[PDB]
Amino acid sequence: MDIDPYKEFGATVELLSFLPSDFFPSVRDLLDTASALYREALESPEHCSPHHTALRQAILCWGELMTLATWVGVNLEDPASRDLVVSYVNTNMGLKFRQLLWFHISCLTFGRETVIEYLVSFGVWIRTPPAYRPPNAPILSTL
Amino acid sequence: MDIDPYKEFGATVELLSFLPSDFFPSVRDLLDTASALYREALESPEHCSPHHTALRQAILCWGELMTLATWVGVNLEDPASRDLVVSYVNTNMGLKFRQLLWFHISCLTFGRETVIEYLVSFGVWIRTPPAYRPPNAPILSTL
Amino acid sequence: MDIDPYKEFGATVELLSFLPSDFFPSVRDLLDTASALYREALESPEHCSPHHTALRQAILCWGELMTLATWVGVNLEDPASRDLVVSYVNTNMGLKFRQLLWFHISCLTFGRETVIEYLVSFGVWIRTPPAYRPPNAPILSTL
Amino acid sequence: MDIDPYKEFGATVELLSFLPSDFFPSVRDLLDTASALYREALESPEHCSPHHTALRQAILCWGELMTLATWVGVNLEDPASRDLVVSYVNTNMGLKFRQLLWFHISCLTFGRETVIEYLVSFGVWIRTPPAYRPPNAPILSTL
Amino acid sequence: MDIDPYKEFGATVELLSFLPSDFFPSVRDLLDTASALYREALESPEHCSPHHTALRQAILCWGELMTLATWVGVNLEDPASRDLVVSYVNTNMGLKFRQLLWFHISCLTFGRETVIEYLVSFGVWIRTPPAYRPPNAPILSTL
Amino acid sequence: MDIDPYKEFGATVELLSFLPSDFFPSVRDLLDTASALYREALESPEHCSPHHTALRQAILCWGELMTLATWVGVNLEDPASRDLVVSYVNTNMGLKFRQLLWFHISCLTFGRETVIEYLVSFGVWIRTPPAYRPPNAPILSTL
Ligand SMILES: CC(C)=CCC/C(C)=C/CO
Ligand SMILES: CC(C)=CCC/C(C)=C/CO
Ligand SMILES: CC(C)=CCC/C(C)=C/CO
Ligand SMILES: CC(C)=CCC/C(C)=C/CO
Ligand SMILES: CC(C)=CCC/C(C)=C\CO
Ligand SMILES: CC(C)=CCC/C(C)=C\CO
């Protein structure tokens, strides 16, 4: 069974394939903003929204991955494989969770409509040849 | 932030901490169940329910963990570390995800009321000593 | 084309694989059942029901496969090849036709509601740990 | 439990033995026509018609036989045996399956009364000695 | 994505796969026909019909292919390759575009109903063996 | 007969002559976004819009050109002419199809009104002398 974690929200993975991978901020940055903006709603006993319902799960899965990484650092004495596994986690799974958390936070903050429009516009930008594409990449803004 | 994945749905981890590991089916079995019963919805573009949302996220996180274990079995060359990490995944996070998938599937099937009452009754039963409890546990079923 | 032989009836091959292959009765037993209970209806000049139509066609396809088995055992002299081909036919196509004929006979005799709920229930039952399920396997009964 | 695949619709193997075996088209051509004209109806979750049900089952049985032929070509080492059985599966079976698909596709396109009138008339034509039958045989058409 | 250029219009390639190459006029002839009959529309600034849209696109693609063949005949200096590519174009894509232009022109002229019924009847005729079919094919015409 | 593939849509070739040739993204980029955004509508059996009706044809013609290029790579042994023809295709016909696919995708995504306004504004930009033209080239955006 294959599931798209955005189809439920009106998007797809080919639509987020527009954005490059080095575009998404650090998981730390994303979690800090998620806290600052939605702590009382994520720690709440309510189906505040599907985006909260899903952000909670993403945060908990990243927490389990962090627990795995620290478990490795404690147990595995072989530095080669210890570091290999920890780096694999933080790089690859970090990228996937960056995409996910970015989608959810940005949508909660701005609007899924605005976020899909941002995706198409950023696709325009990154497809445009450099000689003609502005340096002011599209930026999501409430102001 | 500290999140409880069930508070949003009306439960806690202290209400599921009593359920022993012997209670929970394989993760493969629970995934087969979820597929057979709710594939047309999980693979659908709808906020069918917070349960469907959370189940999608859980399935995807488990897929990520399995890909991690596979990557380990391929790359790592110290069987000590290989065994350690693969076992830790399939046991610890296997059990967490078994709890999760079971809670969601069972609520979807029976009802929040039914499942929470069953958790209460099973907790009474398992907090009771053998010599003072019936020998056959409580049971959730549709025949 | 990709046709699902049960989609037209409300089921799927995934749903019928929710049950093990060691649950379905032999083709001879199922054909005896079909004769006994619906001979004059399957031999009738009427669309008595879509289940009757499908059952007629499945009976005819299995008859052709058995005709092939006899033809092979007779003409094909190579014992190894006749063994392998007859074994493949029997085993594999028998699992398939066992699932099919079981579904059709059972639906005719009981109800699509009953038979689908039975598939679900028996799958959950056989995936559940023994100590937390009813002790007697589910049975599909008329009385 | 002898069953006539056409009695359920209003014909019988006697009425179709009128047409020779050299008459019926290639099974590939017939499946192409089926695709072209009824892909959406056969891949639909509806009892659109008994003809639809029967055609689905016929296509599926032919697919089973195709898988048998492939599995033979790969497993059976004896070239003689594999070629003999594959040539059988094609000639001897495809004959019946061509007859069947033809009946179904025709009675779906043109209708039962028309197909039966056509069978009677083609029987007249093909029974007439060659010295007295016109060159313009009966054709099954809409114009 | 896999597209069928006729599904949008109510047909398939399996419904036109029966039409043999001997059936289709020259591409030059079909283009002369399209011009003479619908130039005032194809050269017009209107969504006259999906057929006109598709016909415009087909004509332009064929013009591009002809410019390609011309560029080859000019630049390339190995007559082997020159012949190979020019012939491949004018035969393979010539035939595809003949199918296309014919379908569009004929639908525009006669009707979706008429053309699809003609395809059905011609497929019956061409799937029939010579000894069992009339000797003169079906015909689409306005006298 | 000369046809403008945009006059039907409210544009011209002198209007797109504004945009340079090195402005349009790769055909791969365009096809990827076309898939992600319009797969279910292009593979649909409906005149969803003239832009779909035309995008399907453009994609199919580019597919035929890719088939020609691979056919060349297989057949033509002479590397000089093989590479010459393949490069001609991918460069020149690629440019033409880039212009076309860009027009259609951008219009479906944003609005033909917005796209023509973008064309005139980009003409302003690229006509403006460098010393006074901003680096932030005009960019199409939903956000
Ligand atoms: C919520 C997800 C996807 C993972 C965390 C699982 C967990 C910590 C369960 C505790 O009972
Ligand atoms: C890990 C979870 C909760 C979901 C899937 C993450 C992923 C691979 C996204 C791809 O864009
Ligand atoms: C649709 C266009 C312009 C080209 C493709 C032609 C084709 C593949 C026809 C199959 O019958
Ligand atoms: C190849 C097709 C379908 C149309 C014409 C492409 C072209 C030369 C556009 C110029 O802007
Ligand atoms: C697979 C099915 C339904 C039938 C096999 C062919 C037959 C027995 C008769 C056709 O004239
Ligand atoms: C549909 C028919 C008559 C045969 C093929 C399917 C089958 C026997 C089991 C389902 O996989």
Side-chain angles (χ1 to χ4, degrees), chain D residues 20 22-23 25 29-33 35-37 109-110 122 125-126 135-137 139-143, chain E residues 11-12 14-15 17-18 114 117-118 120-121 124-129 131-136 138-139:
Chain D
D22 58 275
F23 170 88
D29 277 353
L30 286 172
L31 300 174
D32 284 355
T33 299
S35 303
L37 274 72
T109 318
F110 309 98
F122 197 91
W125 193 81
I126 198 74
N136 60 337
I139 195 82
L140 205 43
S141 163
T142 42
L143 304 177
Chain E
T12 62
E14 294 181 351
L15 195 55
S17 54
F18 297 111
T114 314
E117 293 177 350
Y118 174 75
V120 171
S121 299
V124 181
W125 187 82
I126 194 72
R127 293 195 296 277
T128 317
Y132 304 128
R133 64 177 173 215
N136 44 25
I139 278 164

Side-chain angles (χ1 to χ4, degrees), chain F residues 72-126:
Chain F
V72 160
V74 166
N75 298 62
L76 297 183
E77 70 278 5
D78 310 280
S81 296
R82 192 175 75 242
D83 300 324
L84 202 63
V85 168
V86 175
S87 62
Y88 171 88
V89 160
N90 303 325
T91 297
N92 296 256
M93 312 172 98
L95 165 58
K96 293 164 199 141
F97 276 92
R98 279 162 65 199
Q99 189 161 241
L100 189 82
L101 287 185
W102 176 93
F103 179 72
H104 283 297
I105 299 176
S106 313
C107 186
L108 283 173
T109 316
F110 301 100
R112 192 263 300 165
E113 196 79 41
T114 289
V115 173
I116 296 190
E117 297 160 2
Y118 177 75
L119 286 156
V120 301
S121 293
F122 201 106
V124 174
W125 187 83
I126 195 70

Side-chain angles (χ1 to χ4, degrees), chain B residues 80-95:
Chain B
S81 164
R82 192 163 46 100
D83 306 2
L84 275 160
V85 304
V86 179
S87 178
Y88 172 72
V89 170
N90 283 269
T91 57
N92 284 258
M93 286 178 272
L95 178 51

Side-chain angles (χ1 to χ4, degrees), chain C residues 78-95:
Chain C
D78 187 349
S81 283
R82 49 190 291 177
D83 291 331
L84 207 50
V85 70
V86 178
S87 177
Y88 170 73
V89 163
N90 289 104
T91 55
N92 314 60
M93 300 166 203
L95 169 53

